[model samples]
Target: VNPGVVARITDKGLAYAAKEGLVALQRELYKITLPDFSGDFKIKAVGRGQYEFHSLEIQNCELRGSSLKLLPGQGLSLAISDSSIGVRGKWKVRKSFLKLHGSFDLDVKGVTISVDLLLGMDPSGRPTVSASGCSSRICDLDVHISGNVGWLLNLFHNQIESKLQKVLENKVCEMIQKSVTSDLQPYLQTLPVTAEIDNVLGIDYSLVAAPQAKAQVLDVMFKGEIFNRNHRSPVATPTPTMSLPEDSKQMVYFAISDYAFNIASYLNFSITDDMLPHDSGIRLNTKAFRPFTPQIYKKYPDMKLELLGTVVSAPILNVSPGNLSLAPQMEIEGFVILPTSAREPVFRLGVVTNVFASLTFNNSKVTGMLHPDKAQVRLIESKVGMFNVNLFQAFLNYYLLNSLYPDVNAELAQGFPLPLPRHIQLHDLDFQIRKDFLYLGANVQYMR
Candidate 1:
């Protein structure tokens, strides 16, 4: 649980979103309706003589947009096209020469509308949305009327521009915030995702905390755990860390615990059961025993040897910084037969073996190769009938080195932080055992 080891996670690869991720947002704005547009300020204001504007209605507002880009340290910006608004209202005037109230209809189309928004996170990890900047160019404003006030209202089309902008910043921005949080809250909850390796095992990872935001990337941490299919409940875990990765254009950053391998030690049973060949490591040939033991010849001349019940033990995986080694203990049954005897022979069974090797990482795989450091072989007494038999310790050593030990390389190749689900893979990945944990590094991608 050293923080130094945890901090090294930054050296690993991580990413989340990219600038291209903002382009998917394209949608409409909610309808806006008001009972009336009328007041002293509505029809005449800022030097315009007192007048009344009445019977006001605005409807069917919409926003169409594309070409989105990320502002990184700033905000997200996008351009819109043909966003429109409709207005119908009446203006009144009372004077010595004229007394008239007329209603006019107006339709506006925005040509180069731009919307920019900045998103943040709350203390509770919820997403916070706000409109940062909003702007637009009115391409055309259509005015139509038969009322007497229509002639004067058409000249002041620009007055409505400020109000149109207010509509988007208030109502439209709220819609964007609501729609996104509804979609985003659920996405974050699903977090550091999980996948199954079949019925044998499944992987599950949960977010360690709310994702941290930075200038260029979102730094994310996860508590990753993979377990047996039947083990739905998870066990206690190591101290989680919130270290951030190095600054890069990558949009996301994430990692798994080094303890995952230690938990995976249980997954090796199926493969280990098959590591030792059924025929046994090597069969002692009877022809090679051309000469008979003097004790065997004394009892029954022209002796023969037959073996049975031989078995190889599965590898017990253990690791350390800069070193990994295993000694496979083997057992076998032996018999002493005489050419003059019938089907039966004097027997001495159960000879155990010791084969050792050092672990290695080869061609993106974990394997065990021969090691100069080997366990001392344990020798036991052997007998045939009433007589004690002499077995040369040197003879067994030859078989251990030239024949049996060489075959051990195959068995060691099958043991390690593997034998998990087929779909789960490590690309450009490598590992080294650390003090109290394993340091595994890999270049991987995050996909939804």
Candidate 2:
């Protein structure tokens, strides 16, 4: 599916997530449990020599400062250098029928670990993070043995260091990969693919493609279209092109096209007949239109008439850089209501209005103002008489600008909500209208 929306997580956002990952990595590292180490060797003239290390444990492992960078063609590179750890255990050796038992301490330093990570879409269409090409190296290891034969055992420290270093390198890489799969991947899988907007509307935020990663920027495309709660029919509006800039100052950005808004408008057109204010002081009757269309009142002689307006078609919205323009066609029919149970039709007038709108988010909802700049009228049918519909244009525009639009403005002030989590609040909300798209950038506050 083509993307109707694009969400970008900038370098600032990635840095924050990386910090969290580091914490996760630290927790997983501490959970590593190493078994005892033992080996046997020949001591020459005397006899065979055997050494056993028991209760071997890793302690005080500090990850130190780490680096997480985006690799242009690849996903990401994670590096940790100069990390340190301490290993302490009991050592027992037997040679030439002589046995010595004591405790030993190993101080490991300059531990370097590097991993290449891939971010992509899983088979279930959810975002996934995995590690590959992991490497680990230990620069220095000092093993100190203390016992009756401590000095004699010092000669074998070189061999012990090599074996311990190999064991640590394998363990380090093992723990990191486990954290990537067990801790991070589950978190990414929980990201919502479709969210409920209201009882009747559900917004699809499904991934359109694998996330695109670039230097300091990661872009995730979504099929950000609204669908009905029951049927889930597709919305077919002309797809528009949209691009987000590499602005790292903001943690995240979202760009949505008119396709989504148009789908909303299309679904709302069916209920547009109730657009006018109902049972108000401003009546929609011939008594109100008598002065505007004297020809109709003159022909019927003091007959009370009622005017009913209905939306003829779906409204069209065009998005541009500065503002948004909307056009909705409506028809107003005038008929005689009194004296006979059966109403008599008088005339039909078709009108179209172009309105410029400005939208903003307030109180976690979308609020906007609509101003009708131009109103066009054409006489569709006239049963009583036909004078000129153009003359009535003035009264129609006046009613729209004063009465109809004011009611519409009242409804607009109520604001529509964007799909978001309950605890996440939008702060410093900002937006821009680009060609065919509405781009929004904002910082978020987590109440929890």
Candidate 3:
């Protein structure tokens, strides 16, 4: 006996062998290779006859020819003696109006046959077999029966289980409701009754008003010499010069009357402890002076007071810029101040300094009074008085040096000396007591 056998017939070969004897020979060879040759004759006779003999039947017909085609859930298995086993099956068709189903068990030789099974229809609507699901009797066989049939079976089982579970849940809920209603019906007569709450009304209130009062004033002062007379020295061209008498001291004072006071008052001053002195004399400490004056008239409309004053001067013996004997003498002055406040000091002083020069224009032969040189006041001394400073001398000194002398000389130089000499001086300075002030005062003196 051969160890293994595999036989296949093509369509052409099968058709030709149908007329010849090859078809019968192929079937005989197939039956001889089957593992089982015992049991029912139907099982023994599988694949065991000639095509003509199987098809032709006479009067005493003991057997009928088989007509099986591969279907949706059908397959074949084959096992070789010493080589690896193989499996085959058919491709499924949608609708062919055919149903083919069969089973076989084979026992061949002493070696136990192992088979693997698969199922489906073929493209040609034919059946093919392979040894994919076969085994020996001594050992348990592993029948790998697989097809779309198993999927269909699982789907059917799930559908049935789902329907059954839904029905069971519904029945259980109905039974529970029925039992609850029946049990509660007997207790309803013995229960007590009471009235329920109803008709509720709510009321609320909120208050609105203006915010609390918050108003404040902060006065600050800044101090330092930002500019000086030295900055005004003559440029390339000879600047016209003024002269002072050899024995006199030239004093420069400044005073701002109206809006100029507002400009002068705006300054930044650093605050320190030494500025808190309540003394009468001039305080050299920069902090002791207030850079800005609070507008007292802002609160008291009837209140009136002068704002600014300054003086710039130099001694006659000292030589400085714009100094010439032939030139006329000149001077400038002004002032600014802040009034007393309720919580703060009475007077706050601020200081600034600058230079001034004047020139007289006239023909040497034809000369009259020269035009008044514009007043340029430079701040020399700035001190807040416990009382207001009497500025009578300050004003007089400025008018004499700047206005009277320059005008008289321009007229004198035009001709010669006047009848007497032009002699101007500030003699005595004094202040009349008006209001008894507390924190502000001033010192007044004269120059000749």
Highest TM-score: which candidate?
A: 2
Clashes of each: 4, 0, 69
TM-score of each: 0.40, 0.65, 0.14
Segments of candidate 2 deviating more than 4 angstroms: 40-49, 93-105, 140-156, 259-279, 286-428, 442-448
Best by lDDT: 2
**Error in Å for residue 61 of model 2:** 2.8
Model 2 over residues 66-100: C-alpha lDDT tens digits? Answer: 77778776587888777887877887777767877
Candidate 1 local lDDT, 265-356, one digit each (tens): 21212112234345544333343332323354455444455544333543444454224444444443345554644434443333344433
Distance from true location, Cα of 274 in model 3, Å: 37
Clashes of 1: 4
Task: lDDT for model 1, please.
Answer: 0.43
- lDDT comparison, 1 vs 2, better candidate: 2
